[PDB]
Amino acid sequence: LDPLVIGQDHYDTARGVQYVLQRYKELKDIIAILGMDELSEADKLLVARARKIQRFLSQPFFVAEVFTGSPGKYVSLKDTIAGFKGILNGDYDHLPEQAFYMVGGIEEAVEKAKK
Amino acid sequence: AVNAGISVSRVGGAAQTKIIKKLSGGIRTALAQYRELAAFAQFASDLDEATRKQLEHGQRVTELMKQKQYAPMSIAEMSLSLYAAERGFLQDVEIAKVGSFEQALISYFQREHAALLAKINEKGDFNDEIDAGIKAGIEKFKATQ
Amino acid sequence: AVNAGISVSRVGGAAQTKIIKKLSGGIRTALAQYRELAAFAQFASDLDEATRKQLEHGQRVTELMKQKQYAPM
Amino acid sequence: EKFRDEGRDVLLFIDNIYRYTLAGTEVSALLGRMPSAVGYQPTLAEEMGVLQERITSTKKGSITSIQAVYVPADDLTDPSPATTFAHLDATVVLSRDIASLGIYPAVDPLDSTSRQ
Amino acid sequence: DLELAHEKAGQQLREAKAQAAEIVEQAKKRANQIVDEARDQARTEGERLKAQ
Amino acid sequence: DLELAHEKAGQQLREAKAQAAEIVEQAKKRANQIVDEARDQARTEGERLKAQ
Amino acid sequence: QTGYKSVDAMIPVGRGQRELIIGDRQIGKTALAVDAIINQKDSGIKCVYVAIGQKQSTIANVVRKLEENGALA
Amino acid sequence: ITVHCDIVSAEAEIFSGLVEMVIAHGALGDLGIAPGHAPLITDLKPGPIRLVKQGGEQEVYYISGGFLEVQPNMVKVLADTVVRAGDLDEAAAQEALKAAEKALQGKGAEFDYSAAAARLAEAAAQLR
Amino acid sequence: AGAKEIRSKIASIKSTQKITNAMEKVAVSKMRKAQMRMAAGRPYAERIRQVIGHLANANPEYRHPFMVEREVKRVGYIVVSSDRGLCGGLNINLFKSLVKDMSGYREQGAEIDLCVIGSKGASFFRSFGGNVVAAISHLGEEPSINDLIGSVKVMLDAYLEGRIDRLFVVSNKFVNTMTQKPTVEQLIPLHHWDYLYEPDAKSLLDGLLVRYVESQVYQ
């Protein structure tokens, strides 16, 4: 995970994902006692993206098909960077967070949101 | 007291009998939807149609899963309870009567469909003839008992 | 710095004179009521009259428990 | 045990079962045995079993026991309370609040429990 | 209108009283089944205690 | 009169359902006692035989 | 087959599997395992029950329940 | 002889009780109301209303305007908390128009309101 | 990790729990103070409605623009919201009901004007782009009717000028201490003896109706 090995685009995307997840982790106790409504408008936007990022990191495996019947998915690095970059930039702010759970690629999240 | 959220079997899916294997797929997901919505029962009268139906089904499957000690059920008896819940025959039954409905339905099939229970108990097989035989019996039960 | 909430004597009233045994019953109760109402003290103007009457008494009994060193009564 | 064998039902009161556990820890330390988790004697469960297994109902008569229990640091998971609870059939909880209402005996109907 | 109302009212009340009797007969079939199963259960239980 | 006829038809079915429930519960109580009668009789004879 | 709707439907057990029963004290762990043994009486599977560190009165009650249900043989 | 009288504002009751005479400033001229008076409605100009009763022969209350309503067995003064006039009335409306902060000229046809409402409504359910 | 830091967390949360338990009793006390202020406003509005009903029936020759409906495509809303937070879904459920009813007009091709009371409503329209025409905020826990005169007048003038076809007020109804119901309520489109009507009966009506709408908004 070095700019000289993976290139600036992949490096900045991975750094952006870790920044959002770290900031969401710090809000855990505030959210448990008072809920999301007492957070600033900037924190509310970040929490919504953090919840989508956590779900988009999930993936149905081919060896795990026996446990759930759900078909396995293989995702290229190109499709991985494109999906997380789009979520960080807000291209999917209108999709519900359950649309990103157990979907192979960002296109499958767009199709799942139509159900 | 079985905590479905964390309980799991790594090799039992390949061992389960055909009838219980086909009817149990919807039971696991219905309890997950219940655990996520169970605290809302005090205000659920004012929610969307989809969330209301998911919660109402989760409550019925949760009530159906209760069982007394020293009272084991055969493949055919468990199959009736699972079929009634998976195929939606409990939607018009109140939570307080799901247990009464189950004991009445099993008692009814034991006198009116004894040959079908004997067939299911051999090896827990599930063909179109058995599926048709079960729905015909449950529909006659709902319409007359 | 005696914490009357957790401090206790198993002998109790058997080790007290008639006057101290009679007068201490209300003071033990007053300190107990104050420990429960202490968080509400910063909002006393919004409380019920009966609750405020108990809080005001609890504060005075709590203040009365203070005493200087080398000055036994 | 003598009164039980006369064909009777007997009550055995143990002032504090926690002190029985501690006396075993003290004796085990004097004898130089290697201490267990939380510093209790390695024989903690066996010493409790040797005492508690004699208190039973037999074909001639029975011995029933009422034992006061102390919980160290209010921790119900501590080895002494945890080893003791494996042997109890009922729990009677006395309440300071119920005694203030002038109700006697001051037993809590919601905190008290029984396996029967 | 008054005659038609009485005909429809009377006819539906026949259906309700016929249905009420049919419901009670099915309850009597159930009641006979649960005491038959208990009488046969009791017969096997007494056989178990005598063998024991 | 049509509203009153519907109320009478509704009462008839609810009263039949309440009667059916009582019939089933009374049969359950008789069934439970039938097994207890047999158990007490079998235990009594077992004690008589072993004492002899 | 354990004979329980919840276990046989969601947590199936196969011949030769090791399935852990886990939880706090007094919540049906013994009940679930003894009922699984009772359900095997007509299945052809032979059973072994090992009681480790249990009270003698508890072991005697489990044996009484095995014969009352016809599973002891 | 007496008639029941109440002086009431949009916020609370100013007076309520039995009186023998009520004197007030109507928009066309002053009036004296007594028990059994015919039904009357009028607009009141800013000034003091005088009530008369045994012992309470000079109970005076200042009113900022409003309406007077009379019946043969009841009297009602539908009072005002502050003087209502165009020069005072218009300044508040201009302030309300001036206080309307604007940073973006939104179309009002946004769908986002529903997404954010659903996001927060579900979060408020996890809180209990 | 360490037993020292865990004790500090327990103490921090216990200190917080003591003050949230105190604030619950403070909220109840303020709720009782508000319930008596609701009851004190009822005897005025019910009498104005009784007078309006009689006068409008006794004088059929005149029908104030508020008492007749114009079937055209433009509507107005007065939105009531809190200034402070710590509310268990009060504003969220209200805005959800507002958006639900507003969409019916947006889809029917009708234009919408908004009046806003409270900082939470202002923040919602400022962030989502609502076209607010009049606004007020930072009112006390015991508000005065003179503060509402401006915001209500702007909304009434727009109806009198024919710019607004219907006007509604959006706020929560006190069903019981455990239940607050969000509602949208219409405003503008509202014994055989006569009064003496000292000034013109038509003039009285033109004045009484304005006091009635303001009393409904204040309540």
Ligand SMILES: Nc1ncnc2c1ncn2[C@@H]1O[C@H](COP(=O)(O)OP(=O)(O)OP(=O)(O)O)[C@@H](O)[C@H]1O
């Ligand atoms: N399905 C059930 N329906 C009703 N009661 C039940 C059920 N299963 C267990 N119980 C009751 O739960 C209580 C405790 O059960 P059990 O003794 O099996 O728990 P345990 O966890 O194994 O206890 P222990 O830790 O002492 O061994 C008993 O009263 C038992 O009869």
Ligand SMILES: [Mg+2]
């Ligand atoms: Mg056990």
